[PDB]
Amino acid sequence: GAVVRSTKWPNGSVITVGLYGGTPYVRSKVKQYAQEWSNYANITFNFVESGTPQIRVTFTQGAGSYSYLGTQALSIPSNEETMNFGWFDDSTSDTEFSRTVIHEFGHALGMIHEHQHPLTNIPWDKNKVYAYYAGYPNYWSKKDVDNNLFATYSTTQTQYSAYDTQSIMHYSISSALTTNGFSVGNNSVLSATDKQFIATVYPR
Ligand SMILES: [Zn+2]
Numbered sequence: 327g328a329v330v331r332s333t334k335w336p337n338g339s340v341i342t343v344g345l346y347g348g349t350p351y352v353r354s355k356v357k358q359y360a361q362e363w364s365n366y367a368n369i370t371f372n373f374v375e376s377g378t379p380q381i382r383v384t385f386t387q388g389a390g391s392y393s394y395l396g397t398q399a400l401s402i403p404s405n406e407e408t409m410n411f412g413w414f415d416d417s418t419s420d421t422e423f424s425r426t427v428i429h430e431f432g433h434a435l436g437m438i439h440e441h442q443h444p445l446t447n448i449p450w451d452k453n454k455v456y457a458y459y460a461g462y463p464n465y466w467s468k469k470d471v472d473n474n475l476f477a478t479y480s481t482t483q484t485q486y487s488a489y490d491t492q493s494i495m496h497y498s499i500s501s502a503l504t505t506n507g508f509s510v511g512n513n514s515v516l517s518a519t520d521k522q523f524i525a526t527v528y529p530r
Contacts, residue, residue, distance in 0.1 A: 327493055327523035328443050328479060328486035333396030333436040337528050340370045341434075344379030346407065352385060352414045359427040366521040367528040369435060381434055383409045391426055396436030409434060425514035429494050435524065439474075440496035441510070444481045446489045448499070449506040452476070458503060487523035494520055 335341065343360070345353050357373050364370050371381075381399055384407040391412045394401075399408035409430055414423070441448060455475060459466040466474075490496065491510050494517065501509035 327440065327490060327495065327520055327527075328438050328484045329436040329527050330395050330438060330479070330483060331485050332483070333398055334485075334527065335369060335396060335436070338368050338530075340372050341381055342377065342379040343371050343373045343381040344375075344383060345373065346382060346384045348385040348411075348414070349416055351416050352411075352418070355414075355418070355420075355423045356383065356411070356427050359423050360431045362424075362428055362516065363431055363435060363524065366516070367435065367524040368530045369528050371431070378404055381409060382407045383411065385411050385414060387412060391430055393430040393433035395433055395438070399434065421514050425494075425512070428516060432495050432520075432524075435528070437495050437524075438479055438484070440490060440493040441475065441499065442478045443489045444479045444484050444486055446478060449504050449508055450476060451503055451505045455503050485527060487519055487526070490517055490519040490523075492517040492519070 343357075345356060348356070357371075360371050360373075382402075382404075386407075389410050389412050391410060393409040402408050411426065411430070440446075456468070456471055458464075459471055459475075464470075492513050494513055494515065496510055496513055498512050499508070499510040501507050
């Protein structure tokens with residue numbers, strides 16, 4: 327796990343969260359798996375239907391799933407979302423809710439992508455990575471690949487644990503895209519390192 331230091335919330339802080347749209351099913355599932363973080367981190371997510379929430383969540387279809395890093399949400403205008411879930415519906419399984427709700431709420435806590443960990447040096451087969459992401463279903467450009475995959479953060483701007491391949495913040499990496507046989511599977515729950523690291527970041 328790795329957190330951008332400048333995006334960290336004050337420890338023990340209660341973060342207001344607003345849900346805008348979504349079915350009762352999707353909404354309850356978002357809250358259910360978001361509050362999973364509070365079992366290990368000294369951070370509370372307060373889901374509200376009142377006031378001006380610090381975290382604002384939408385469900386705009388096709389817009390992808392994302393979130394701003396921690397307190398970056400403060401810079402965002404009140405008429406915009408800080409977090410969006412792009413593919414949920416009333417047929418979404420618990421495994422999928424767990425995999426991406428926890429992950430985007432990990433971003434909301436200040437955590438980056440684990441494949442961009444400051445201690446890592448993942449053996450990308452760069453040409454094959456470019457080739458795959460250039461086509462369906464991502465259609466990414468060179469700037470997209472270089473910034474979202476290849477680039478890593480620095481140890482100076484981040485508070486980090488050891489590189490964790492099982493982290494909820496680690497994207498799947500196929501052995502077909504590496505030069506090493508190295509591969510990362512599908513992580514859909516909080517890893518042991520996750521629970522430990524987010525505890526050191528927001529300790530009790
Ligand atoms: Zn992410």
